[PDB]
Structures are given as C-alpha cells and as structure tokens.
PDB file of C-alpha atoms in Angstrom:
ATOM      1  CA  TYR A 724      -7.987 -14.393   5.977  1.00 20.56           C
ATOM      2  CA  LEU A 725      -7.031 -15.236   2.176  1.00 23.49           C
ATOM      3  CA  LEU A 726      -7.630 -11.789   0.678  1.00 24.43           C
ATOM      4  CA  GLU A 727      -6.012  -9.201  -2.159  1.00 20.60           C
ATOM      5  CA  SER A 728      -3.095  -7.766  -0.835  1.00 17.02           C
ATOM      6  CA  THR A 729      -3.900  -4.114  -1.480  1.00 15.12           C
ATOM      7  CA  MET A 730      -6.909  -4.658   0.708  1.00 17.93           C
ATOM      8  CA  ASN A 731      -4.608  -6.522   2.893  1.00 18.16           C
ATOM      9  CA  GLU A 732      -2.030  -3.397   3.033  1.00 18.62           C
ATOM     10  CA  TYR A 733      -5.032  -0.818   3.374  1.00 16.43           C
ATOM     11  CA  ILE A 734      -6.296  -3.022   6.468  1.00 20.44           C
ATOM     12  CA  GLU A 735      -2.992  -3.714   7.966  1.00 18.49           C
ATOM     13  CA  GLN A 736      -2.711   0.055   8.088  1.00 12.28           C
ATOM     14  CA  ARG A 737      -5.707   0.997   9.944  1.00  9.63           C
ATOM     15  CA  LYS A 738      -6.733   1.237  13.897  1.00  6.25           C
ATOM     16  CA  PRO A 739      -6.580  -0.913  15.616  1.00  4.95           C
ATOM     17  CA  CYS A 740      -3.783  -2.487  13.194  1.00  2.50           C
ATOM     18  CA  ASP A 741      -4.309  -6.049  14.797  1.00  2.00           C
ATOM     19  CA  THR A 742      -3.767  -7.692  11.744  1.00  2.00           C
ATOM     20  CA  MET A 743      -0.836  -8.382   9.817  1.00  2.00           C
ATOM     21  CA  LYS A 744       0.249  -9.434   6.614  1.00  2.00           C
ATOM     22  CA  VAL A 745       1.975 -12.840   6.510  1.00  2.00           C
ATOM     23  CA  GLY A 746       4.336 -14.106   3.348  1.00  2.00           C
ATOM     24  CA  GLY A 747       4.556 -12.902  -0.020  1.00  2.00           C
ATOM     25  CA  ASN A 748       1.918 -13.202  -2.821  1.00  2.00           C
ATOM     26  CA  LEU A 749       0.558 -16.365  -3.799  1.00  2.00           C
ATOM     27  CA  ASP A 750      -0.229 -14.643  -7.659  1.00  2.00           C
ATOM     28  CA  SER A 751       0.329 -11.804  -9.702  1.00  2.00           C
ATOM     29  CA  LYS A 752      -2.682 -10.308 -11.256  1.00  2.00           C
ATOM     30  CA  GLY A 753      -4.383  -6.445 -11.720  1.00  2.00           C
ATOM     31  CA  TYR A 754      -7.990  -4.769 -11.867  1.00  2.00           C
ATOM     32  CA  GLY A 755      -9.385  -3.579 -14.991  1.00  2.00           C
ATOM     33  CA  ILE A 756     -12.339  -1.375 -15.414  1.00  2.00           C
ATOM     34  CA  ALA A 757     -15.435  -3.739 -17.317  1.00  2.00           C
ATOM     35  CA  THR A 758     -17.701  -2.321 -20.100  1.00  2.00           C
ATOM     36  CA  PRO A 759     -20.321  -5.207 -21.433  1.00  2.00           C
ATOM     37  CA  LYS A 760     -19.121  -7.433 -24.403  1.00  2.00           C
ATOM     38  CA  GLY A 761     -19.468  -5.079 -27.751  1.00  2.00           C
ATOM     39  CA  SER A 762     -20.190  -1.857 -25.783  1.00  2.00           C
ATOM     40  CA  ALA A 763     -19.584   1.992 -27.468  1.00  2.00           C
ATOM     41  CA  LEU A 764     -17.508   2.709 -24.154  1.00  2.00           C
ATOM     42  CA  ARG A 765     -14.776  -0.307 -24.465  1.00  2.00           C
ATOM     43  CA  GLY A 766     -12.128   1.833 -26.421  1.00  2.00           C
ATOM     44  CA  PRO A 767     -12.492   5.048 -24.566  1.00  2.00           C
ATOM     45  CA  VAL A 768     -12.387   3.618 -21.217  1.00  2.00           C
ATOM     46  CA  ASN A 769      -9.042   1.850 -22.445  1.00  2.00           C
ATOM     47  CA  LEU A 770      -7.391   5.010 -23.594  1.00  2.00           C
ATOM     48  CA  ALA A 771      -8.610   6.992 -20.403  1.00  2.00           C
ATOM     49  CA  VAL A 772      -6.977   4.406 -18.185  1.00  2.00           C
ATOM     50  CA  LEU A 773      -3.652   4.703 -20.377  1.00  2.00           C
ATOM     51  CA  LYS A 774      -3.657   8.400 -19.976  1.00  2.00           C
ATOM     52  CA  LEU A 775      -4.527   8.414 -16.606  1.00  2.00           C
ATOM     53  CA  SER A 776      -1.938   5.933 -15.873  1.00  2.00           C
ATOM     54  CA  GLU A 777       0.780   7.507 -18.484  1.00  2.00           C
ATOM     55  CA  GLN A 778      -0.095  10.887 -16.274  1.00  2.00           C
ATOM     56  CA  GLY A 779       0.386   9.382 -13.019  1.00  2.00           C
ATOM     57  CA  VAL A 780      -2.981  10.072 -11.509  1.00  2.00           C
ATOM     58  CA  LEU A 781      -3.237   6.551 -10.545  1.00  2.00           C
ATOM     59  CA  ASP A 782      -0.263   6.228  -8.428  1.00  2.00           C
ATOM     60  CA  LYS A 783      -1.670   9.675  -6.648  1.00  2.00           C
ATOM     61  CA  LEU A 784      -4.741   7.765  -6.027  1.00  2.00           C
ATOM     62  CA  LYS A 785      -2.955   5.114  -4.353  1.00  2.00           C
ATOM     63  CA  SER A 786      -0.139   6.858  -2.969  1.00  2.00           C
ATOM     64  CA  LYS A 787      -3.243   9.174  -1.060  1.00  2.00           C
ATOM     65  CA  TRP A 788      -5.726   6.296  -0.592  1.00  2.00           C
ATOM     66  CA  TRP A 789      -3.348   3.874   0.808  1.00  2.00           C
ATOM     67  CA  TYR A 790       0.037   5.460   2.446  1.00  2.00           C
ATOM     68  CA  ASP A 791      -1.587   8.376   4.060  1.00  2.00           C
ATOM     69  CA  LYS A 792      -4.059   6.315   5.960  1.00  2.00           C
ATOM     70  CA  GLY A 793      -1.144   5.115   8.536  1.00  2.00           C
ATOM     71  CA  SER A 807       9.839  -3.293  31.054  1.00  2.00           C
ATOM     72  CA  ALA A 808      10.042  -3.853  34.421  1.00  2.00           C
ATOM     73  CA  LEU A 809       9.719  -7.897  35.849  1.00  2.00           C
ATOM     74  CA  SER A 810       6.343  -8.032  37.760  1.00  2.00           C
ATOM     75  CA  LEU A 811       4.608 -11.073  39.881  1.00  2.00           C
ATOM     76  CA  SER A 812       3.479 -12.920  36.489  1.00  2.00           C
ATOM     77  CA  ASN A 813       7.049 -14.363  35.596  1.00  2.00           C
ATOM     78  CA  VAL A 814       8.478 -14.766  38.977  1.00  2.00           C
ATOM     79  CA  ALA A 815       5.427 -16.650  40.273  1.00  2.00           C
ATOM     80  CA  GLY A 816       6.908 -20.073  39.839  1.00  2.00           C
ATOM     81  CA  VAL A 817       9.591 -19.789  42.674  1.00  2.00           C
ATOM     82  CA  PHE A 818       7.181 -18.204  44.837  1.00  2.00           C
ATOM     83  CA  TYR A 819       4.879 -21.331  44.357  1.00  2.00           C
TER      84      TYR A 819
ATOM     85  CA  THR B 416     -26.518   9.420 -18.339  1.00  2.00           C
ATOM     86  CA  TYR B 417     -26.052   4.971 -17.981  1.00  2.00           C
ATOM     87  CA  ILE B 418     -25.729   3.673 -14.459  1.00  2.00           C
ATOM     88  CA  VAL B 419     -21.585   2.784 -13.596  1.00  2.00           C
ATOM     89  CA  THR B 420     -22.324  -0.185 -11.508  1.00  2.00           C
ATOM     90  CA  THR B 421     -19.884  -0.550  -8.306  1.00  2.00           C
ATOM     91  CA  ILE B 422     -19.556  -2.088  -4.848  1.00  2.00           C
ATOM     92  CA  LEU B 423     -18.999  -0.763  -1.034  1.00  2.00           C
ATOM     93  CA  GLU B 424     -15.286  -1.751  -0.374  1.00  2.00           C
ATOM     94  CA  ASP B 425     -12.707   0.335   1.515  1.00  2.00           C
ATOM     95  CA  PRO B 426     -10.769   2.369   0.796  1.00  2.00           C
ATOM     96  CA  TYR B 427     -12.334   2.110  -2.861  1.00  2.00           C
ATOM     97  CA  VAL B 428     -15.826   3.500  -1.838  1.00  2.00           C
ATOM     98  CA  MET B 429     -17.162   4.805   1.054  1.00  2.00           C
ATOM     99  CA  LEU B 430     -20.267   5.968   2.104  1.00  2.00           C
ATOM    100  CA  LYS B 431     -19.156   9.468   3.623  1.00  2.00           C
ATOM    101  CA  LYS B 432     -19.622  10.308   7.520  1.00  2.00           C
ATOM    102  CA  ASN B 433     -23.209  11.562   7.467  1.00  2.00           C
ATOM    103  CA  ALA B 434     -23.812  10.506   4.103  1.00  2.00           C
TER     104      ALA B 434
ATOM    105  CA  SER C 676       1.540  30.790   8.587  1.00  2.00           C
ATOM    106  CA  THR C 677       2.867  27.839   9.909  1.00  2.00           C
ATOM    107  CA  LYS C 678      -0.366  26.350  10.481  1.00  2.00           C
ATOM    108  CA  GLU C 679      -1.641  27.203   7.489  1.00  2.00           C
ATOM    109  CA  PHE C 680       2.221  26.043   5.870  1.00  2.00           C
ATOM    110  CA  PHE C 681       0.827  22.453   7.335  1.00  2.00           C
ATOM    111  CA  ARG C 682      -2.298  22.387   6.203  1.00  2.00           C
ATOM    112  CA  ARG C 683      -1.831  23.205   2.842  1.00  2.00           C
ATOM    113  CA  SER C 684       1.136  20.651   2.120  1.00  2.00           C
ATOM    114  CA  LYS C 685       1.692  18.265   0.124  1.00  2.00           C
ATOM    115  CA  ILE C 686       4.636  16.647   1.025  1.00  2.00           C
ATOM    116  CA  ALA C 687       4.606  12.802   2.119  1.00  2.00           C
ATOM    117  CA  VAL C 688       6.131  13.839   5.878  1.00  2.00           C
ATOM    118  CA  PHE C 689       4.395  17.085   6.447  1.00  2.00           C
ATOM    119  CA  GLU C 690       0.831  15.605   4.842  1.00  2.00           C
ATOM    120  CA  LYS C 691       1.375  13.351   7.576  1.00  2.00           C
ATOM    121  CA  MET C 692       2.286  15.954  10.386  1.00  2.00           C
ATOM    122  CA  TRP C 693      -0.719  17.791   9.103  1.00  2.00           C
ATOM    123  CA  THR C 694      -2.920  14.560   9.767  1.00  2.00           C
ATOM    124  CA  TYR C 695      -1.232  14.132  13.215  1.00  2.00           C
ATOM    125  CA  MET C 696      -1.692  17.209  14.076  1.00  2.00           C
ATOM    126  CA  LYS C 697      -5.443  18.049  13.298  1.00  2.00           C
ATOM    127  CA  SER C 698      -6.836  15.031  15.073  1.00  2.00           C
ATOM    128  CA  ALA C 699      -4.484  15.380  17.951  1.00  2.00           C
ATOM    129  CA  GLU C 700      -6.048  15.171  21.328  1.00  2.00           C
ATOM    130  CA  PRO C 701      -5.759  17.052  23.578  1.00  2.00           C
ATOM    131  CA  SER C 702      -5.369  19.924  21.216  1.00  2.00           C
ATOM    132  CA  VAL C 703      -1.649  20.444  20.234  1.00  2.06           C
ATOM    133  CA  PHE C 704      -1.760  23.510  18.882  1.00  5.32           C
ATOM    134  CA  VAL C 705      -1.654  26.792  20.741  1.00  6.41           C
ATOM    135  CA  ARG C 706      -2.525  30.495  20.959  1.00  7.06           C
ATOM    136  CA  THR C 707       0.793  32.625  21.316  1.00  2.00           C
ATOM    137  CA  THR C 708       4.250  31.851  20.595  1.00  2.00           C
ATOM    138  CA  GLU C 709       4.855  32.442  24.670  1.00  2.02           C
ATOM    139  CA  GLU C 710       1.996  29.937  25.358  1.00  2.04           C
ATOM    140  CA  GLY C 711       3.794  27.021  23.045  1.00  3.26           C
ATOM    141  CA  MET C 712       7.570  28.521  24.693  1.00  2.60           C
ATOM    142  CA  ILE C 713       5.755  27.695  27.900  1.00  4.05           C
ATOM    143  CA  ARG C 714       3.973  24.218  27.441  1.00  3.78           C
ATOM    144  CA  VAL C 715       7.817  22.868  26.141  1.00  2.46           C
ATOM    145  CA  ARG C 716       9.274  24.404  29.291  1.00  2.00           C
ATOM    146  CA  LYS C 717       6.302  22.351  31.148  1.00  2.00           C
ATOM    147  CA  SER C 718       5.882  19.723  29.095  1.00  2.00           C
ATOM    148  CA  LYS C 719       9.484  17.945  30.644  1.00  2.00           C
ATOM    149  CA  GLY C 720      10.672  17.568  26.986  1.00  2.00           C
ATOM    150  CA  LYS C 721       6.945  15.774  26.135  1.00  2.00           C
ATOM    151  CA  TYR C 722       6.198  18.930  23.661  1.00  2.00           C
ATOM    152  CA  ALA C 723       8.144  19.460  20.314  1.00  2.00           C
TER     153      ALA C 723
ATOM    154  CA  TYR D 724      23.092 -14.196  -6.118  1.00  2.00           C
ATOM    155  CA  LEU D 725      20.639 -11.924  -8.179  1.00  2.00           C
ATOM    156  CA  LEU D 726      18.620 -14.989  -9.992  1.00  2.00           C
ATOM    157  CA  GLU D 727      15.275 -16.019 -11.648  1.00  2.00           C
ATOM    158  CA  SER D 728      12.558 -17.426  -8.581  1.00  2.00           C
ATOM    159  CA  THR D 729      12.304 -19.890 -10.783  1.00  2.00           C
ATOM    160  CA  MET D 730      15.848 -21.381 -11.089  1.00  2.00           C
ATOM    161  CA  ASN D 731      16.215 -20.328  -7.328  1.00  2.00           C
ATOM    162  CA  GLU D 732      13.612 -22.400  -6.299  1.00  2.00           C
ATOM    163  CA  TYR D 733      14.779 -25.336  -8.325  1.00  2.00           C
ATOM    164  CA  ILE D 734      18.418 -25.445  -7.049  1.00  2.00           C
ATOM    165  CA  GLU D 735      16.897 -24.858  -3.837  1.00  2.00           C
ATOM    166  CA  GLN D 736      14.544 -27.949  -3.715  1.00  2.00           C
ATOM    167  CA  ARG D 737      17.527 -30.210  -4.406  1.00  2.00           C
ATOM    168  CA  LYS D 738      21.155 -31.493  -2.795  1.00  2.00           C
ATOM    169  CA  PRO D 739      23.247 -29.653  -1.341  1.00  2.00           C
ATOM    170  CA  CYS D 740      20.407 -28.257  -0.535  1.00  2.00           C
ATOM    171  CA  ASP D 741      22.282 -25.390   1.668  1.00  2.00           C
ATOM    172  CA  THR D 742      20.980 -22.621  -0.260  1.00  2.05           C
ATOM    173  CA  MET D 743      17.843 -20.813   0.800  1.00  2.00           C
ATOM    174  CA  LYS D 744      15.763 -17.982  -1.543  1.00  4.74           C
ATOM    175  CA  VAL D 745      15.300 -14.648   0.971  1.00  6.59           C
ATOM    176  CA  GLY D 746      12.693 -12.318   0.739  1.00  7.92           C
ATOM    177  CA  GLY D 747       9.857 -11.721  -2.231  1.00  9.44           C
ATOM    178  CA  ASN D 748      10.406 -11.126  -5.868  1.00  6.64           C
ATOM    179  CA  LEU D 749      12.087  -7.522  -6.941  1.00  5.15           C
ATOM    180  CA  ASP D 750       9.582  -7.782 -10.097  1.00  4.53           C
ATOM    181  CA  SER D 751       7.268  -9.555 -12.309  1.00  4.85           C
ATOM    182  CA  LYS D 752       7.935 -11.157 -15.577  1.00  4.36           C
ATOM    183  CA  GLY D 753       7.771 -14.081 -17.891  1.00  7.03           C
ATOM    184  CA  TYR D 754       9.999 -16.216 -20.083  1.00  7.44           C
ATOM    185  CA  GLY D 755       8.355 -16.104 -23.791  1.00  7.66           C
ATOM    186  CA  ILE D 756       8.657 -18.251 -26.836  1.00  4.15           C
ATOM    187  CA  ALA D 757      10.944 -15.686 -29.172  1.00  8.80           C
ATOM    188  CA  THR D 758      10.818 -15.628 -33.276  1.00 10.93           C
ATOM    189  CA  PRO D 759      13.128 -13.679 -35.726  1.00  7.55           C
ATOM    190  CA  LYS D 760      11.074 -10.196 -36.196  1.00  4.33           C
ATOM    191  CA  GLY D 761       8.540 -10.618 -39.184  1.00  8.64           C
ATOM    192  CA  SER D 762       8.732 -14.614 -38.717  1.00  9.65           C
ATOM    193  CA  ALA D 763       6.054 -16.442 -39.870  1.00  8.94           C
ATOM    194  CA  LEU D 764       6.006 -19.131 -36.793  1.00  8.24           C
ATOM    195  CA  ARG D 765       4.870 -15.976 -34.494  1.00  8.93           C
ATOM    196  CA  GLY D 766       1.295 -16.549 -34.544  1.00  5.52           C
ATOM    197  CA  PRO D 767       1.095 -20.442 -34.788  1.00  6.40           C
ATOM    198  CA  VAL D 768       3.503 -20.519 -31.782  1.00  3.45           C
ATOM    199  CA  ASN D 769       1.569 -17.998 -29.605  1.00  3.98           C
ATOM    200  CA  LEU D 770      -1.739 -20.219 -30.351  1.00  2.00           C
ATOM    201  CA  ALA D 771       0.093 -23.168 -29.433  1.00  4.41           C
TER     202      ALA D 771
END
C-alpha cells in the first residue's frame, strides 16, 4: 500500500503490527488547514497554526497520538533425511 | 457556529468507544 | 502513591509503563506489599 | 562522506561505481537562485 508516512508509521505500530514501512519517503510535503478562497477565517487560522507550532502544541499532539500508541530444531527442518 | 468539515481517519478523527 | 505517581506521570518512559500496567492481564497490581513480595518470590523471577 | 543527496545520487550512478548512499536523508532543503539583497532581479528570477 502506498500511503502517507504519518498514517504508515501509526499503523506499523498498532497491533497486530503485521505491517512494516519499507524504504524511505518518495517525496516531502505537509498538511495544511484549508479555508474557502476569500474566507474571513484565512488570517486568524494561519496565525493560530503559527502560534500552535511555535508553542510546541503540534509536536506534543503528534507525540501523544503517534509514539504513545506503540528455538529447538523440529521435525519440519530435518524431515528431508527421514524421507 | 459554522461547520469544520472533516474525515474519519486514525489517529486524526475517531469515534469514541460507545460513541 | 506509586500507582498514583505512574498514573499521573507525563515522562515518556513512565507514561509507557502506565499504559502497559493499566491494560496488563492478569492484573499486575497487588493489594499489599507482602502480596507483591510473595508474588516476586513465587513468580520464579518473572515478576518485577 | 556527508554530502547532498543530489550529488551523492549522481556520483553513485557513475563509474567507478564503488560508492553508495546509506540510509535516508538527514534533513530536507533545496537550492535557490540567489541575488544581492535589494536586487531588482529577485522578482523576475522567481517568476522565471
């Protein structure tokens, strides 16, 4: 499955964790809060996100929602000589 | 009050156990 | 106080330890210190 | 040698191909066309 690294890391940590992320990232990008073009919420939302980022809120939310998720030989491998 | 449109996607938006 | 220390901890290691302890089965917790002492003594080195 | 991924990739694609990139990228950045501060070529170069 080709998906975003964030969802990938989250899933690869969840039980039964029978999935694994392979290789590096195919590119670099980011999630943004959207607003209708010409919206009155455009500027306040931008400043809110800058404030949240500069205050460590986004890092804490990410850490809380992602990181906190977290012999003897048998007859099967010697059956050849018995056959 | 206006609507913040969203989507269901773990771990961004989840319905609480016994929603 | 130890259970309450682990429950309201915000250190990554202690939060990880609390998340494990709260959802461990059978209950890792005990009712008395003697109970935990006998549990470690009779768990044959499988209980910390 | 710690160098930029673009140069690393170009080198690893050419003989004597005895060198190889190890792991992912330590960070993310990009090259830009520079101009002296207060230059009038800044806008046209960006649009170009």
